[PDB]
Write a protein that binds this ligand. Structure first.
Ligand SMILES: C[C@@](O)(CCOP(=O)(O)OP(=O)(O)O)CC(=O)O
Ligand SMILES: C[C@@](O)(CCOP(=O)(O)OP(=O)(O)O)CC(=O)O
Ligand SMILES: [Mg+2]
Ligand SMILES: [Mg+2]
Lengths: 285, 285
């Protein structure tokens, strides 16, 4: 007997970092980008060596089940770097309960994914987890709620993994340390997110693309982008992408690019891997 | 013309600090404990000198309304120290919109109170604001949600203000810096909150009181209580309180004590002010 669990991932269109301060964020489920965790028997009991979201999901699950001596090991595993912190949490929790064949209502799961994220010190706005449990793009505000969005632009979004494992915590630190000097950054993002909705409302991928490139500049100035991400966006843009920006926690992670044609989309991903992206993925919009 | 806004407050029964890591928290509306803010005309435009939740509520309101030159001043004002960070935010926002006679749906308000709290760097779990907008006690978990609780113990809760202005941010820092050593603290609180629900379910004020005293010890050990708070609880207990603990952000703030008789309640508050509490208040349960 082996326990297995699997979660889908997501990608942030816009609102990264700003969501942390109560500003809206729009994100898209990545239903075909999944993560899997297996749980197996072990000689010695399971221990806690780190504050990473996986170990933390195990712990939070064990605490719940009330098991201190869990003689088990929980490894991971696709599309590697495209699985988020929450995605990993969800998968583990499921794998753990499944191993123990424990009952798991959706409320509980959601409660435990967010708790693991929190004790992993990821400082969740609640957006990652939320989107990984949704099957529709959503509009989100921390500590308040979300609404599902209609998303039909007949466009494609190309996702590229920078290869650099995102230092999300450090990124939140940067924006946090800026204090009041982040307000203009936050403000600018708040606006861009508003227009982003309009554009989406009007099914104007071009308008949208523009807004995204902008979002990237502000994310870059505030200091949470990366050279890998920046050069990938540049490549994106220098190949006719309606727009491009980094998505997620920053300081590593992924890039997203907007396009309205399939030939173009496949071309862009190729071009990107060619430039050094470890993986790519094309999502319909 | 003068703008005015008014919010009610709340008190945390249990889950302080632990709620920050995704653990449940139970809190009670304080409908008769209100805060008021007035907004008036001014010579020079309004500026931002600090990251305190009031100024932050003004800013977030102005940003929303899209007013940069707000030639206005927004002062505060009762039951002083019993008004929370969110309570102050709510009152200001209302006073500001009211001054401008701007439309304000409840969604917007709630969105702006939480945003102000966030830019004021208060690190809201969402509980303060939530309870200040509720008229029923609630069970709460960060980034997930809340449920209203039935609360009928025919008991009284005595609230005492330590006088020391709570250093809530610093307190969150302490628990944050403990890292993994806070897990046992969090765990213990998670449990206590569970029993707290049971007791409430069974209308067992004694059982409940016990749990509260315990909650105070763990809050004290982890290092977020205060001498003023501790000595007040001690006085509470040394006078037959079913239980007592600090409530709120810690490092200052208030104490709550449980009792089931009115004579006892009034007696306790007196005794407490006598010991140095700046204000007291008795809420029905
Ligand atoms: C900074 C944030 O606003 C965005 C984080 O984006 P992701 O959750 O996609 O990042 P990782 O899971 O670390 O790869 C934090 C937050 O809102 O949770
Ligand atoms: C530490 C916390 O869990 C409890 C804060 O309690 P209050 O919001 O009542 O404190 P103040 O408004 O500063 O007086 C933080 C949180 O959950 O928001
Ligand atoms: Mg994340
Ligand atoms: Mg507060």
């Amino acid at each position: 007997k082996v326990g297995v669990g699997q979660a889908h991932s997501k990608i942030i269109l816009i609102g990264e970092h700003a969501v942390v301060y109560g500003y809206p964020a729009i994100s898209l489920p990545l239903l075909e980008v999944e993560v899997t965790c297996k749980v197996v028997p072990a000689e010695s009991p399971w221990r806690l060596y780190e504050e990473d979201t996986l170990s933390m999901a195990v712990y939070a699950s064990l605490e719940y089940l009330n098991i201190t001596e869990a003689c088990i090991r929980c490894e991971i595993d696709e599309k590697r770097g495209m699985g988020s912190s929450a995605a990993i949490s969800i998968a583990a929790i499921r794998a753990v309960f499944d191993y123990y064949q424990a009952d798991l209502p959706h409320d509980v799961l959601e409660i435990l994914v967010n708790r693991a994220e929190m004790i992993a010190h990821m400082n969740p706005s609640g957006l990652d987890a939320k989107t990984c449990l949704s099957d529709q793009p959503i509009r989100f505000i921390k500590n308040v709620g979300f609404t599902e969005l209609e998303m039909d632009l007949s466009a494609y979004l190309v996702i590229a993994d920078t290869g650099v494992y995102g230092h999300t915590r450090e990124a939140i630190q940067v924006v946090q340390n800026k204090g009041k000097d982040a307000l203009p950054f936050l403000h600018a993002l708040g606006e861009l997110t508003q227009q982003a909705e309009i554009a989406i409302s009007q099914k104007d991928a071009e308008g949208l693309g523009q807004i995204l490139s902008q979002a990237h500049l502000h994310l870059k100035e505030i200091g949470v982008s990366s050279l890998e991400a920046d050069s990938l966006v540049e490549t994106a843009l220098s190949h006719g992408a309606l727009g491009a920006k980094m998505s997620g926690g920053g300081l590593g992670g992924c890039i997203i690019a907007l396009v309205t044609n399939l030939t173009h989309a496949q071309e862009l991903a190729e071009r990107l891997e060619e430039k050094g992206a470890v993986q790519t993925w094309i999502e319909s919009l």
